[PDB]
């Protein structure tokens, strides 16, 4: 599923990400964009044999099990295909867990480079919430 910016904004708000653990909603919308480009089904394989899954491009070395990745840790306790669904549910739940560690959103390379420090609230301007 490919999302509109405003359609994702509202979904993420429905899924409790406005102001989750100190992060406002534009943070998640911006990251989704630069990670996956609003596509729930994006997959990207890495040099080290791990893959990133879904709208938030969540990595199989740490967060989920794909049965392909060497020393996988499965911190989110979820198979990586759950992260692919048209529903954003699994992806949000797992991103909530990721962000509850001290690193917070610095886990996402794209977010560090594109969103962090910018006027992220821009990403929710326009939509009825």
């Amino acid at each position, epitope marked *: 599923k490919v999302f509109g910016r405003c359609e994702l904004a509202a979904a993420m708000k*429905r899924h*409790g990400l*406005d102001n989750y653990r100190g992060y406002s909603l534009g943070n998640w919308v911006c990251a989704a964009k630069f990670e996956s480009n609003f596509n729930t089904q994006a997959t990207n394989r890495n040099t080290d044999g791990s893959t990133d899954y879904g709208i938030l491009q969540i990595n199989s070395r740490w967060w989920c099990n794909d049965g392909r990745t060497p020393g996988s*840790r499965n*911190l989110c*306790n979820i198979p990586c295909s759950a992260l692919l669904s048209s529903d954003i549910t699994a992806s949000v739940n797992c991103a909530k*867990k990721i962000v*509850s560690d001290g690193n917070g959103m610095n886990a996402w390379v794209a977010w560090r480079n594109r969103c962090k420090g910018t006027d992220v609230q821009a990403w929710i301007r326009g939509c009825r919430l």
Partner: single-chain antibody
Amino acid sequence: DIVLTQSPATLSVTPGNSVSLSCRASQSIGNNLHWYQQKSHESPRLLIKYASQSISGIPSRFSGSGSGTDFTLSINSVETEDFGMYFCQQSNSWPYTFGGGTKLEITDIQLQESGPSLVKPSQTLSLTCSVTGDSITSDYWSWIRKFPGNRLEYMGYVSYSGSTYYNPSLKSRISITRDTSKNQYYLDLNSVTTEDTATYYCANWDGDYWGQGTLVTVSA
């Protein structure tokens, strides 16, 4: 801290009836509200997560709804097994917090706590949680305690990076550490007072797995 007002305080009911329990929050918390059932000191059991999402192995009849600041646990057609306390918990903001409880009167991986059960005032309480079935490097780990008047308190957790979150009411008396090569994690609570008498539970961050709990008394 986000404060969660649960109501009604107690509720009596005939098997077959439907019920609704209410949780209201002092500030907007999105969908970040979870429900537990606890039968007179046993580990709480997670029933609904994130306001309305099902939990695998939990009976159909339990459902939830709401958002923002109004939340409802529904028991469509009550069974006798459903007796006990019910608690809401937020995870939107640190510290995590628990509602005051609603009494309902009807008409693989294991965790184990070890430590003392009697401690002198002013001493350090040390607890161990031994994990079985997976690596402690494969999750986040929490400590929670239940006070004698039913009150529940989230004490803290340690997360993959080794970073830790502690409840500010413990004012720096608390410490949480891991020993990877033993598959253990630890609670240290300095300078105990009679206030600290409670049942202590270890649990993973998900709230899926809980130890059995252990009673610790602080006594002159």
